[PDB]
Nucleic acid binder design. Structure first.
Lengths: 428, 414
RNA sequence: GCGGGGGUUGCCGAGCCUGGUCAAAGGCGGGGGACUCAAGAUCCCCUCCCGUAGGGGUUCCGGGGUUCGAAUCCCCGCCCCCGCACCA
RNA sequence: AUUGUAAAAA
């Protein structure tokens, strides 16, 4: 009988964008957290002299996070609208913590890009040093295709629902998104809000008459753009590990359905393992269909050295792996020379493994897909080519042509992005 | 300086080609007579050695050991005194390529004084002492902190080496909007507390030997908040705290963030000075990123480009079977100067690549780095002999061929 | 610092108190040998530099003075060691 | 009234 859909929603934002504050509202306004709880959050924050974080302390959990008003470890919280069940993902407001940010990006399908409009906070977000770049290269890398752009901090001293700041946000993002992750101009939705007062999250503001579109909680519910459910022999990338009620494992069901009490096997590992209890998204299930962010209690031979960034797989039809591969790379800002023997760290899904380019194949154009018939010394900025790649150890991969969320990769070195990679031939 | 490039090349050669000097039995004497000793004392103690090796056991081993004490006994009376550098002698008999046998008799005076003594007869020569002649730049320690674990390692030259590393578990669940701070504090205020403790433990176990830091200093690499707690700790206090060269804010940990901690700390180590060579392979690369043209790569371009002007830096790779040959011409009374590798060289009739097949007659052959060492100052300013162990090093050898130059003008190429 | 006495050939030490009869006794050590397989006692030869014929050259700390002539006679310098004492 | 190392037993 009637099921509400299980998908997560993720908040990617400027460092100071109030990703926690909007979180705190959206649970309160859907009743998921009690009045008593808001009173206690008010009190604990005041007593340690932290007034303007009352809502933020709902998502900011750790000490350094509460203190500064933005996350460092990934945070998960459950709320329920009229059509769906959500787990909402606060992704770190600090930038040294990219492993918590990739696991937040990975569980998406849907990503909400939260931009602060405040003078100082807005402009700084679109620089190289901001978090907007690192967040857009991750959403594209995780499969995101409908971007929700939420303009926060809009009822503030220096913003009076400024249509000019709002237009500045839109205008700046269409080329910035188009450049960093190859986004098209459309499948983008804009909405002004404020997180501190909750303006335009559930009810319409009268400080803002010019925006007569839907608020955030009525919208998000009624958005049709969800592409999560994938039939096939079954696949789970591990996104998080932790002990609570038994040992628990979190990931996205990126192919098929896994029933309670049954074998998996892990990969490349080949580690036999049985489910003990299934919480799909954040409620108990015994059956669980594809596309749902799984939170499984496991029983295995190992349970505390269990590594994130490898797959669980069918026991039954286990799954492709490398450690040698050919791939298309596209050189956005090394910005200098890559020739053969170049190294970097490799992001696919929740993996972050070292990699080196063995031999360099051929040059390829952006247009038509057409390769050169000769082979080069090297490649430079704004070109594209095909290269052979060895990882340090062994990763499990699909081809981009198989499934792009296990195929699309990011060449990470410094706090920058050198190329966006597309795996073509899995060797051996 | 250009004269010490040649010395190091010689020493590399010498070192390798004295292990490749293997024999059998105890026919392979290594003798190192230290600064200003007593010629007669040594020569006598070798007549005491010949006397006991006149038993020794096993026929051909006797007779060969005798003939190899005899070679030194005769030549050691040539010397008037033990020079200030001492005498290093290596006498024996070795099998070489094609399973052929050669009586090897070496006796020299090290360029820099030898600081060790040794009379030892194995079935190969000993080469460990000659490493001390070129000696050290250091040798840094690297602590890599991350919220999943930590890693103890060193960087000596361009070589990252991993000495030790452990992983930590933290419960990443604290509630769902109604956050339990008893879940926050309970296990973490002891995981984190014991972890800065164990970092300081595994820093004192690994980076301190004989009451002193073995490495020259520590570079500390880490994610936020875990390192300003570790640096200023009382657990890290005393000797480690006073050897903190630089810190580094990094985006990842482990071996991934061991690389990123050198990228960021490059010029503060310094002088490593192999790291600074990797920087300068950086600088060659980002000439080649631009239209300004002071770059060349490969043999061909690079070569004619050194011939018709001058390089500021001439950058060559340490191992390197490419050599300068001078071939006369088959027609006689004309000649060719060509660069070959072991494969082309085996076709002694053409001495060239199989696809061309051109006829030649070789007269002399100088190793391409040795030829360069002996003329870099008449063809440019500065020479760099370079390693492959760094990501810039790796690239030089793989996709330029371990040969190129930063010129003093705008060149053009094929 | 002030004095006093010393520095010899590879080393140690005579001989220098006897200026020409000192290229320097002796010991130890080195080198060559016999000794009878090998050491190695014992003994013999050689042992400042240079030189084809016992020739040339240079010595007794460095450098001068006096003498036809000084390693040997007189003075200064450096260096060493020793007392006593202001200061070190 | 000296000193002498390394792979032999159907």
């Amino acid at each position: 009988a009637p099921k509400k859909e299980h998908v997560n929603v993720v908040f990617i934002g400027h460092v100071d964008a109030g990703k926690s504050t909007i979180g705190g509202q959206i649970m309160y306004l859907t009743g998921m957290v009690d009045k008593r709880t808001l009173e206690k959050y008010e009190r604990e924050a005041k007593e340690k002299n932290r007034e303007t974080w009352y809502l933020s302390w709902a998502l900011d959990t750790n000490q350094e996070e509460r203190d500064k008003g933005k996350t460092v470890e990934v945070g998960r919280a459950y709320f329920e609208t009229e059509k769906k069940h959500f787990t909402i993902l606060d992704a770190p407001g600090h930038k040294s913590f990219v492993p918590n940010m990739i696991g937040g990006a990975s569980q998406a399908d849907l990503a909400v890009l939260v931009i602060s409009a405040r003078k100082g906070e807005f402009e700084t977000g679109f620089e190289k040093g901001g978090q907007t770049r690192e967040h857009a290269m991750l959403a594209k890398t995780a499969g995101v295709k409908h971007l929700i752009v939420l303009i926060n901090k809009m009822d503030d001293p220096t913003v009076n629902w400024s249509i000019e700041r709002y237009e500045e946000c839109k205008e700046k993002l269409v080329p910035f998104l188009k450049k960093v992750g190859f986004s098209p101009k459309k499948d983008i939705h804009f909405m002004p809000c404020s997180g501190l007062t909750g303006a335009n999250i559930k009810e319409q503001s009268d400080f803002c008459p010019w925006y007569t579109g839907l608020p955030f909680i009525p919208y998000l519910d009624n958005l049709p753009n969800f592409n999560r459910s994938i039939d096939g022999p079954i696949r789970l990338p591990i996104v998080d590990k932790y002990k609570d009620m038994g040992t628990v494992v979190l990931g996205k069901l990126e192919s098929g359905s896994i029933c309670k009490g049954q074998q998996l096997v892990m990969m490349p590992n080949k580690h036999n393992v049985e489910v003990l209890g299934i919480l799909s998204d954040d409620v108990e299930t015994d059956t669980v269909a594809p596309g749902e962010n799984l939170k499984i209690r496991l029983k295995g031979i190992e349970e505390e050295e269990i590594l994130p960034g490898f797959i669980l797989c069918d026991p039954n039809n286990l799954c492709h792996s490398g450690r040698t591969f050919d791939a298309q790379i596209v050189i956005i800002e090394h910005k200098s020379i890559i020739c053969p023997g170049y190294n970097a760290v490799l992001h696919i899904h929740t993996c972050i493994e070292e990699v080196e380019i063995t031999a360099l194949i051929c040059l390829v154009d952006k247009k038509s897909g057409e390769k050169s018939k000769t082979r080069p010394r090297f490649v430079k900025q704004d070109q594209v080519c095909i290269a052979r790649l060895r990882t340090a150890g062994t990763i499990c991969l699909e081809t981009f042509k198989d499934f792009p969320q296990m195929g699309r990769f990011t060449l990470r070195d410094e706090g920058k992005t050198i190329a966006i990679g597309k795996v073509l031939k899995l060797v051996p | 300086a250009a004269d010490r490039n040649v010395e190091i090349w010689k020493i590399k050669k010498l070192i390798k080609s004295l292990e490749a000097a293997r024999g059998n039995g105890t026919s392979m004497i290594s003798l190192i007579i230290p600064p200003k000793d007593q010629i007669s004392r040594v020569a006598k103690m070798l007549a005491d050695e010949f006397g006991t090796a006149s038993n020794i056991k096993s026929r051909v081993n006797r007779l060969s050991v005798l003939g190899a004490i005899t070679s030194v006994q005769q030549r050691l009376k040539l010397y008037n005194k033990v020079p200030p550098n001492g005498l290093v002698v290596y006498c024996g008999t070795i099998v070489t390529e094609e399973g052929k046998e050669k009586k090897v008799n070496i006796d020299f005076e090290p360029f820099k004084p030898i600081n060790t003594s040794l009379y030892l007869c194995d079935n190969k020569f000993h080469t460990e002492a000659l490493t001390a002649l070129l000696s050290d730049d250091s040798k840094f320690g690297f602590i890599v902190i991350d919220g999943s674990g930590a890693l103890f390692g060193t960087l000596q030259g361009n070589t990252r080496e991993v000495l030790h590393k452990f992983t930590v578990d933290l419960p990443k669940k604290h509630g769902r909007g109604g956050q339990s701070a008893l879940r926050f504090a309970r296990l973490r205020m002891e995981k984190r507390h014991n972890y800065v403790r164990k970092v300081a433990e595994t820093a004192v176990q690994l980076f301190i030997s004989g009451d002193k830091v073995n490495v020259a200093g520590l570079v500390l690499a880490g994610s936020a908040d875990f390192k300003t707690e570790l640096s200023q700790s009382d657990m890290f206090d005393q000797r480690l705290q006073s050897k903190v060269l630089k810190l580094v804010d990094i985006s990842y940990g482990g071996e991934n963030g061991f690389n990123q901690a050198i990228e960021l700390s490059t010029e503060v180590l310094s002088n490593v000075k192999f790291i600074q060579e990797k920087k300068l392979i950086g600088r060659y690369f980002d000439e080649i990123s631009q239209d300004t043209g002071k770059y060349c790569f490969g043999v061909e371009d690079t070569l004619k480009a050194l011939e018709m002007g001058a390089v500021e830096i001439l950058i060559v790779y340490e191992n390197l079977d490419i050599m300068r040959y001078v071939l006369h011409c088959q027609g006689t009374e004309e000649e060719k100067i060509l660069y070959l590798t072991p494969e082309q060289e085996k076709d002694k009739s053409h001495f060239t690549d199989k696809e061309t097949g051109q006829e030649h007659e070789l007269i002399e052959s100088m190793p391409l780095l040795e030829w360069f060492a002996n003329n870099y100052k008449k063809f440019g300013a500065t020479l760099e002999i370079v390693t492959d162990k760094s990501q810039e090093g790796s690239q030089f050898v793989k996709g330029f061929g371990g040969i190129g130059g930063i010129l003093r003008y705008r060149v053009d190429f094929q």
